[PDB]
UniProtKB/Swiss-Prot annotation, chain B:
Residues 52-71 are annotated as: Disordered. The chain holds residues 152 to 222 of 231 of the full protein. It comes from Staphylococcus aureus. It is found in: Secreted. The gene is nuc. Transmembrane segments: none annotated. Residues 52-68 have a biased composition (Basic and acidic residues). This is Nuclease A. The active site is at R18.
């Protein structure tokens, strides 16, 4: 009988974390993983963030479901406080107990406050590094996660401009490697899979996977032994207009032609 | 309804840190020429070269080398 979050990372066991997630999410979902943060010195606050196994229906609804539970002085204030979470990290459910903020704090405070603006900007790193954490911890859990929240995470490079590279590792897609609509192959896999003359990252920007994979542009390269990543997103071109280069390796939409398709054909 | 997969209970992996960037989506994202740096190279697909005349342009038969004198 004690406030779970207020305890140390060691004083809470694995079971209690996953059990506690069911309270804050108003669900019975077990998180694939989490990170317990407690900060000391000037601004003392406990942040406790989880990664859900599946996407709620009301995640993409006309109503908000992104946000954390705001606690102040170990007293509940309000929930769905989304000012702590970015758009590409809107999938996170969790809580944050702030000792610094007033007890009479409300939603507009969190928006306009410079300290709380720094709070979001801090949590951005801990979630993102917790995403790659999950990607290295359990690839199959992260595969489920990416099928449920992958569309959200593709908004990444746009928000954290200078940090595009980190999300580029997190990006999972299909390809001419495997006919699976399952988003398996990352840019990590692709760079490892690259051969002689395939220094240019081949993608297809298409509205549907059916029309993407039915395109002759694939077979033009596939017969030569080139691998093209299959994007069936609605956000595909928007994201890929900032994904012009990664690692020094420049991207190519096969839906467009340049000197690369002159020399290759 | 969470999948759980097999066990799920047992991470304790954590991984703590902070050394990245963040701004916001309102900036430059959309509208760019997605053909950056013309780079491509594969194995020889082999196209028709040398009709027979030996003197297309100068020497289609590579009459400059041994030219295959048959030796």
């Amino acid at each position: 009988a004690q406030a779970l979050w207020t305890r140390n990372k060691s004083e809470i066991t694995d079971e209690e974390y996953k059990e506690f997630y069911k309270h804050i999410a108003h669900d019975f979902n077990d998180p694939l993983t989490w990170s317990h943060n407690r900060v000391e010195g000037k601004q003392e606050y406990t942040s406790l963030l989880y990664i859900p196994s599946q996407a709620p229906w009301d995640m993409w609804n006309r109503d908000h479901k992104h946000g954390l539970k705001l606690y102040v002085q170990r007293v509940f204030i309000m929930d769905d406080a989304e000012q702590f979470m970015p758009n590409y990290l809107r999938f996170v459910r969790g809580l944050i107990d702030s000792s610094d903020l007033p007890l009479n704090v409300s939603r507009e405070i969190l928006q306009d406050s410079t300290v709380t603006r720094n709070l979001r900007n801090a949590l951005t790193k801990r979630v993102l590094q917790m995403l790659e954490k999950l990607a290295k911890d359990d690839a199959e859990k992260y595969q489920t996660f990416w099928q449920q929240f992958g569309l959200v995470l593709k908004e990444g490079p746009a928000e954290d401009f200078a940090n595009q590279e980190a999300i580029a590792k997190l990006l999972r897609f299909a390809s001419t490697h495997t006919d699976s609509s399952a988003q398996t192959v990352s840019l990590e896999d692709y760079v490892s899979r690259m051969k002689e003359g395939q220094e240019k990252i081949y993608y297809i920007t298409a509205d549907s996977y059916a029309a993407a994979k039915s395109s002759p542009h694939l077979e033009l390269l596939r017969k030569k032994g080139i691998e093209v990543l299959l994007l069936s997103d609605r956000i595909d071109e928007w994201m890929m207009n900032y994904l012009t280069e990664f690692d020094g390796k420049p991207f190519q939409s096969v839906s467009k032609v340049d000197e690369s398709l002159e020399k290759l054909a | 309804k969470k999948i759980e997969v097999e066990f799920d209970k047992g991470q304790r992996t954590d991984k703590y840190g902070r050394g990245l960037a963040y701004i916001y989506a309102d900036g430059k994202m959309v509208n760019e020429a997605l053909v950056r740096q013309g780079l491509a190279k594969v194995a020889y697909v082999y196209k028709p070269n040398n009709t027979h005349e030996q003197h297309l342009r100068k020497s289609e038969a590579q009459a400059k080398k041994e030219k295959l004198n048959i030796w």
